[PDB]
């Protein structure tokens, strides 16, 4: 809980100010991307894509006026620059994936994710209603894609690399 989330150089992950890659510890070849799900015409679901590494960088944000992130904080997670709320993560029921990670254009004050230590890195945990019980984000294989989606007990484990290559 009171543990500070750190990047792959061991430094505290910043609150909103920097972008970071979520690098899978057992799938370092793959990176986050947006893909189509169900019948949508725009790509709105987040996949682990073997074609892109390190993938789309994200920012972790808390309303707290602190510039570090702890594992106990509720976080919004978003693609894109801080000035934009068009790539905000949410978890949305979608058949046949399940509870799929998707991107939206609206942000609540408190997001529903936490970043929690797991194995050698961190998993993303979704808290429906921001209550006490969290659901692990892992991978759901459907239609030739590996979708980030709830898979409780089967988390995809990531390490967090500051996105200074850009």
């Amino acid at each position: 809980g009171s543990s500070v989330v750190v990047d792959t150089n061991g430094q505290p992950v910043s609150n909103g100010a920097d972008a970071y890659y979520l690098v899978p510890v057992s799938h370092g070849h793959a990176g986050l991307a947006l893909a189509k799900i169900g019948n949508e015409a725009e790509p709105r679901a987040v996949v682990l894509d073997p074609h892109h590494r390190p993938g789309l960088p994200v920012r972790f944000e808390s309303p707290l006026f602190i510039n570090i992130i702890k594992e106990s904080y509720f976080l919004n997670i978003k693609f894109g620059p801080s000035s934009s709320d068009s790539g905000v993560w949410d978890v949305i029921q979608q058949d046949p994936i399940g509870l799929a990670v998707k991107v939206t254009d609206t942000k609540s004050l408190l997001g529903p994710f936490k970043v929690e230590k797991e194995g050698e890195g961190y998993k993303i945990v979704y808290y429906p209603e921001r209550g006490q019980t969290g659901l692990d984000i892992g991978l759901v294989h459907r239609n030739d894609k590996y979708y980030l989606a709830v898979k409780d007990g089967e988390p995809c484990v990531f390490k967090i690399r500051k996105a200074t290559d850009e």
Binding site: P12, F65, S82, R130
Partner: protein, 223 residues
């Protein structure tokens, strides 16, 4: 601190820097010779605290002290409801001698008055996104409870009050958490939280409403 300026050196002698491997992550406020008040969200299992500072380099600040603390108590209702009751008390491993650059401040017993201009100080981000080299000071005005609940319900709780949100864009920002909001001579609030980004017209920041906690604070300090 958004749109403020260098404080006059040592003009806020209750200001405490909480630092972690030599980097500031929060402030605190000396409220007794052996106790610093900070936001509960800044909790760590132990602290290095900087008192008497202006720049954050102690080796350049005569009169400053870098002190250790292991004990801290979060308020028992911290984060129920979420974000509420955001205060904790850090016990310094030893009491400090007060001087003119290290001094504690009295806590307001009356609750904030809508409209009143107050001062916030801290070393968090400036309008341009960088960290300042010396402590920043800014005035912000208390917003009414009606406006605060309107903008922040369902997360507005009376353990908070709003200040700022003016056309002047003066506000707190990341790194200011835990530091003081001073009204009319007394410690009225602690920097707590707001909606990003900082210094938006019409969006005030939210501060811990210390006038609600004076009894717990006193009892905790005396036990």
């Amino acid at each position: 601190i958004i749109n403020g300026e260098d404080c006059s050196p040592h003009s806020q002698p209750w200001q405490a820097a909480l630092v972690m491997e030599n980097e500031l992550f929060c402030s605190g406020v000396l409220v007794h010779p052996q106790w610093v008040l900070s936001a509960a969200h800044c909790f760590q299992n132990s602290y290095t605290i900087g008192l008497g500072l202006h720049s954050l380099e102690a080796d350049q600040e005569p009169g400053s002290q870098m002190v250790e603390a292991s004990l801290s108590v979060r308020h028992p209702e911290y984060n129920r409801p979420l974000l509420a009751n955001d205060l904790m008390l850090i016990k310094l491993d030893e009491s400090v001698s007060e001087s003119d650059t290290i001094r504690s401040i009295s806590i307001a017993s009356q609750c904030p008055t809508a409209g009143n201009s107050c001062l916030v100080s801290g070393w968090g981000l400036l309008a341009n996104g960088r960290m300042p080299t010396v402590l920043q000071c800014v005035n912000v005005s208390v917003v009414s409870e009606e406006v605060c609940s309107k903008l922040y319900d369902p997360l507005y709780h009376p353990s908070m009050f709003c200040a700022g949100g003016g056309q002047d864009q003066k506000d707190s920002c990341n790194g200011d958490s835990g530091g003081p909001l001073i009204c009319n001579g007394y410690l009225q609030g602690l920097v707590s939280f707001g909606k990003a980004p900082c210094g938006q017209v019409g969006v005030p920041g939210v501060y811990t409403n210390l006038c609600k906690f004076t009894e717990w604070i006193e009892k905790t300090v005396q036990a």
